[PDB]
Design a protein around this ligand. Structure first.
Ligand code: HEM
Length: 431
């Protein structure tokens, strides 16, 4: 049978993610009682909810069966779950399809492989070492401002958001004075269904509001990135903007500008927001588990383990969708050609078949098998930059912290997509 309606709504509807406790209890109910069922929520297409770690890997390693963008019918699947009214808005705007960005999540092989190869080498761990000193100087400047501002703050809006934004805009080539604009458009982009992040220029209460906000935000990013692409093509620099802006295909022709736009939107949004969420979630966990803060100050070589367990627990990228290109049997269920799937990375990260005491914050999981970056050819391109920035910041910050106390009510972004904390009121004790 269909998944029970209140479990299905908890995961599908963005409002279901406002509070992590009922959300994670819904993922757990499925993993334990209905690990592969179809959610049939009013206003949404039917979705197979992929809740089990093994099933996330099985789907993601088979892109010839489970497409992101619809395969040869390009744009026939939206990889980022919108409601039906929203997908209808987008088909009206684009003319029949949902490919509103040329960014990697919307692409299938072989197009996906050709475009990803433009930046694959730049993002490898050996090619990121040249940025470590600049990252460390940025972390140290951010920590100097934290110490100067005193012990009482919102660890998100008054600390964690700034470091990853400055890192990516510096590597990317965007000037420091444009950081506030990029931060505002990132809030619009990941806040399409959050009541406190509504744009002024869209009908907030329309059935397709989130889709209108998504489209409006992308148009603003395009306007900004068109100037940057033309600038770097005219005058190349040694920055990531140039690598993407000047990229040419196998025939020597630039990729269409929208392909650069797509990289730039992904880097300008996911490139800082997920890292900020993970850092704030790490601070929240160190408040709950002060013995962990003591241990990592005692042995700074535990910092990568702390980053891996923060990634597993926070898991800020909650899903992407796939479509079945053929019928496929999994876990005793018959997925039919055309059926959509929702990949629940946060649920995979709590799967008791893989993780002992999966809700416990345990930095001693070695290896830490988390799937917070996903899997398969679409696996996070930024993962190594994220792990480096979080390592460098924790190496510089934790010596300066004796204790983190949460002094006020935490707030999460209301989204089923790219979430995590927007507010974490703390009282810090500095060393
Ligand atoms: C804590 C940090 C982050 C987490 C947890 C995260 C997580 C994810 C996840 C789960 C996916 C989807 C993988 C899949 O479809 O199987 C993804 C995709 C992606 N992420 Fe990350 N991300 C992080 C940081 C970053 C950064 C720093 C960048 C860029 C600077 C980035 C760029 C991307 C891009 C471009 C994609 C699309 C890849 C594709 O579809 O081929 N991410 N990320």
């Amino acid at each position: 049978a269909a998944i029970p309606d209140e479990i299905a709504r908890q995961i599908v509807l963005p409002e279901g993610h406002k509070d992590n406790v009922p959300l994670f209890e819904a993922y757990r109910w499925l993993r334990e009682n209905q690990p592969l069922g179809q959610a049939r929520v009013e206003g949404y297409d039917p979705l197979w909810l992929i809740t089990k770690y093994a099933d996330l890997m099985e789907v993601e390693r088979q892109p010839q069966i489970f497409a992101a963008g619809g395969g040869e019918d390009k744009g026939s699947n939206n990889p980022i779950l919108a409601n039906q009214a929203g997908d209808e808005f987008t088909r009206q705007l684009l003319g029949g399809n949902l490919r509103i960005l040329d960014a990697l999540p919307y692409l299938d092989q072989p197009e996906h492989s050709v475009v990803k190869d433009v930046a694959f080498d730049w993002f490898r761990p050996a090619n990121l070492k040249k940025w470590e000193d600049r990252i460390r100087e940025t972390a140290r400047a951010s920590i100097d401002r934290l110490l100067a501002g005193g012990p009482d703050l919102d660890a998100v809006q008054e600390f964690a958001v700034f470091f990853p934004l400055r890192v990516i805009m510096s590597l990317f080539g965007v000037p420091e004075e444009d950081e506030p604009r990029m931060m505002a458009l990132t809030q619009d982009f990941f806040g399409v269904a959050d009541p406190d992040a509504q744009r002024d220029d869209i009908e907030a209460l329309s059935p397709d509001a989130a889709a209108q906000q998504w489209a409006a935000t992308i148009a603003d990013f395009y306007a900004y990135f068109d100037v940057l692409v033309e600038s770097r093509r005219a005058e190349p620099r040694d920055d990531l903007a140039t690598l993407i802006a000047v990229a040419k295909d196998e025939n020597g022709e630039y990729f269409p500008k929208t392909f650069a736009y797509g990289w730039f939107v992904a880097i300008a949004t996911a490139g800082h927001d997920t890292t900020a969420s993970t850092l704030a979630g790490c601070l929240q966990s160190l408040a709950a588990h002060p013995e962990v803060l003591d241990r990592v100050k005692g042995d700074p070589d535990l910092i990568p383990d702390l980053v891996n367990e923060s990634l597993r627990i926070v898991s800020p990228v909650k899903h992407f969708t796939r479509v079945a290109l053929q019928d496929y049997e999994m876990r005793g269920q018959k997925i039919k050609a055309g059926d959509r799937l929702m990949l629940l990375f946060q649920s995979g990260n709590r799967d008791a078949e893989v993780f002992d005491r999966p809700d416990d914050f345990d930095i001693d999981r070695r290896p830490n098998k988390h799937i917070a970056f996903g899997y398969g050819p679409h696996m996070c391109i930024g993962q190594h930059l994220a792990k480096l920035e979080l390592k460098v910041m924790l190496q510089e910050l934790l010596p300066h912290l004796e204790r983190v106390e949460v002094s006020g009510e935490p707030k999460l972004i209301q989204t089923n997509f790219v979430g995590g904390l927007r507010k974490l009121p703390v009282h810090l004790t500095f060393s």
